[PDB]
Design a protein around this ligand. Structure first.
Ligand SMILES: NC[C@H]1O[C@H](O[C@H]2[C@H](O)[C@@H](O[C@H]3O[C@H](CO)[C@@H](O)[C@H](N)[C@H]3O)[C@H](N)C[C@@H]2N)[C@H](N)C[C@@H]1O
Ligand SMILES: Nc1ncnc2c1ncn2[C@@H]1O[C@H](COP(=O)(O)OP(=O)(O)O)[C@@H](O)[C@H]1O
Ligand SMILES: Nc1ncnc2c1ncn2[C@@H]1O[C@H](COP(=O)(O)OP(=O)(O)O)[C@@H](O)[C@H]1O
Ligand SMILES: [Fe+2]
Ligand SMILES: [K+]
Ligand SMILES: [Mn+2]
Length: 567
């Protein structure tokens, strides 16, 4: 067997710590640090808990590993931006895998994988396609913010890159910050965009061309001498520019004691909804730029299959329009397009180099921890809530959903990536014209303008959606057929878009069975599926997490493992 532990996360200015374990090219385990620590975004940390879980899941120690792989060329970043890489592999391993958690007889081989290559590997090798065009777009790797590459014959060959100062990721983040939604919530900006109108998609900053874009607002070779990426340089340029060209100045954050909460809370001076037009315009600019890049690399490679990864790959709206594009026949974007995925991608790049073949991801992201009935019952008993073990859990949950109840659903291995996919989900009626406001305003406490997304049987997705293909990850939007756009109001957006999950019996028998039962009740085997967490907080992982959230929020029922708890 070849066993490779991929890692992301480092104590110095880092985010999205995660760990993935490949055994013979198959994913044995994969988790995000934030889900285990309950600290959102897994900032500034080696993936200690995620990696400990991976080893425990596979019954392994560090001594059983053929290699440890890290998803950045860290040594090169230290040499370039911080005056040298001070660590021996052994010292680096003591940081990535502290010995108090990871005892070891000796050091496994340590590999650093260039950041965009790791992103690329997480898309290509797990796609089930043997070749295609690679588009990597994020905030910034070691230097570049975009990579165009060719994936073929098991190799990934870089064709071109874009310098960090021209980052589409930084741009989008800075606009997000500017609106008051926050740089850490670009997904909110994506949601806001449909409520607004675009007049000038250049923002007087971008020039567009058939191969991508230009930003004469910033010297493309600008480098921050005081930091190790161009985040701060771009932030200043964008904030100055936006305040100059947009009718509203930056939205400011307000911190004030709230006597009803008994604590200082953070709010915004203006309602971010006010900036909806800027959101629409920023979204259109992003799409325009990426369409160019995508057309370019597809043409240069002679491929019609497109692989996308990097954080900008989380832009499901952009992905859905790329899919629709005349230059694209097939598209694969992994659930872990952000830095969450470079642990997996580093592991894959190394496993391939070591002679393994990588299995397709397979329409599932369920690789985190799962809990047996006994473990769940122990968390249940801890709380002293009454509960049942229904003879047919799936039927009862479907009936609860049909009646307009919101149901927590914590089953099997936790999802990796930012979307709940029927493992750690909050479920509600797709057919209810009030469910959307109820979950936003009452349950998860979100902005009224934020849309929800549906799960549905793959077997009916052709009838429901304007595109007939697998959508296993909720990472692409598409249009709902007019025949259903009115039947499924809670899971449709301002522009008749939806961000669906298609479910196969193979991928998730239980969820599949629940949806089937639901279809017998409401006509369509479709439900609202939002992630099981208070708005803002990390998706719940453990039975105790789920119970804490079930009890803090006005959720009607919780199906956790084989048990059902009702308020
Ligand atoms: N607004 C107040 C906050 O701003 C910053 O955080 C912000 C980070 O600086 C942002 O950037 C981080 O992530 C980006 C990529 O998004 C990396 O390029 C960069 N190295 C890393 O710093 C990240 N994307 C969002 C986060 N809120 C500062 N850490 C201070 C404070 O916590
Ligand atoms: N929905 C979205 N639309 C556009 N950009 C996004 C979206 N979600 C995340 N991003 C971008 O992803 C970038 C971070 O990507 P990632 O590869 O995870 O980190 P890094 O750039 O540090 O390697 C951020 O700049 C953020 O703006
Ligand atoms: N069809 C869609 N079009 C555009 N954006 C969407 C669509 N569906 C969902 N979204 C966005 O996805 C985001 C998912 O929310 P998330 O970050 O998981 O928050 P929470 O913490 O409430 O679970 C929402 O903010 C919403 O804007
Ligand atoms: Fe990245
Ligand atoms: K097409
Ligand atoms: Mn969510």
């Amino acid at each position: 067997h070849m066993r490779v532990l991929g890692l992301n996360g480092w104590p110095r200015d880092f985010h999205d710590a995660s760990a993935a374990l490949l055994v013979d090219g198959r994913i044995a385990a994969f988790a995000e640090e934030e889900r285990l620590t309950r600290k959102k975004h897994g900032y500034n940390t080696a993936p200690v808990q995620a990696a400990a879980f991976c080893l425990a899941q596979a019954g392994l120690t560090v001594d059983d590993l053929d290699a440890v792989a890290f998803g950045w060329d860290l040594p090169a970043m230290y040499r370039e931006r911080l005056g040298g890489w001070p660590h021996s592999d052994s010292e680096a391993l003591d940081i990535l895998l502290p010995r108090d958690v990871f005892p070891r007889r000796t050091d496994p081989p340590l590999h650093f994988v260039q950041h965009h290559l790791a992103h690329a590997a997480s898309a290509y090798y797990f796609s089930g396609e043997d070749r295609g065009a690679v588009l990597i777009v994020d905030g910034q790797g070691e230097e570049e913010c975009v990579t165009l590459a060719h994936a073929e014959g098991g190799k990934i060959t870089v064709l071109d890159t874009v310098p960090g100062a021209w980052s589409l990721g930084f741009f989008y983040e800075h606009v997000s910050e500017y609106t008051g939604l926050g740089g850490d919530n670009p997904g909110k900006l994506m949601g806001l965009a449909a409520h607004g109108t675009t007049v000038d998609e250049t923002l007087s900053a971008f020039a567009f061309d058939s191969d991508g874009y230009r930003l004469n607002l910033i010297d493309p070779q600008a480098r921050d001498p005081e930091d190790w990426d161009e985040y701060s340089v771009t932030e200043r340029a964008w904030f100055a520019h936006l305040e100059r060209i947009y009718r509203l100045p930056p939205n400011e954050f307000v911190r004030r004691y709230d006597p009803a909460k008994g604590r200082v809370v953070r709010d915004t001076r203006r309602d971010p909804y006010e900036y909806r037009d800027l959101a629409a315009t920023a979204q259109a600019a992003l799409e325009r730029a990426v369409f160019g890049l995508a057309d370019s690399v597809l043409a240069r490679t002679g491929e019609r299959t497109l692989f996308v990864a990097g954080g900008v790959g989380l832009n499901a709206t952009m992905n859905g329009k790329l899919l629709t594009r005349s230059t694209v026949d097939k598209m694969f974007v992994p659930p872990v397009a952000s830095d969450i995925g470079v642990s997996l991608g580093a592991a894959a790049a190394v496993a391939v180099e070591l002679g393994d073949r990588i299995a397709p991801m397979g329409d599932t992201a369920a690789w985190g921890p799962e809990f047996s009935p006994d473990q769940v019952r122990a968390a249940l008993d801890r709380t002293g809530l009454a509960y049942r073990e229904p003879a047919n859990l799936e039927r009862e949950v479907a009936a609860l959903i049909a009646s307009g109840k919101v149901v927590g659903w914590a089953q099997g291995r936790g999802e990796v990536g930012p979307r709940a996919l029927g493992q750690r989900s909050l479920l509600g009626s797709a057919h209810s014209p009030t469910m959307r406001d109820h979950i936003n305003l009452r349950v998860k406490d979100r902005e009224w303008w934020r849309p929800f997304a549906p799960s549905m049987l793959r077997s009916v997705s052709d009838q429901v959606l304007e595109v007939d293909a697998d959508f296993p990850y909720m990472i692409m939007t598409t249009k709902v057929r007019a025949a259903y756009a009115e039947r499924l109001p809670s899971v449709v957006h301002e522009d008749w878009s939806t961000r669906p999950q298609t479910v196969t019996e193979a991928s998730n028998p239980r969820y599949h069975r629940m949806l089937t039962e639901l279809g017998d009740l409401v006509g369509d085997p479709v439900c609202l599926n939002t992630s099981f967490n208070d708005r803002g907080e990390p998706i719940v992982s453990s039975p105790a997490d789920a119970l804490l959230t079930f009890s803090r929020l006005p959720i009607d029922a919780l199906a956790v493992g084989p048990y059902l708890v009702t308020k």
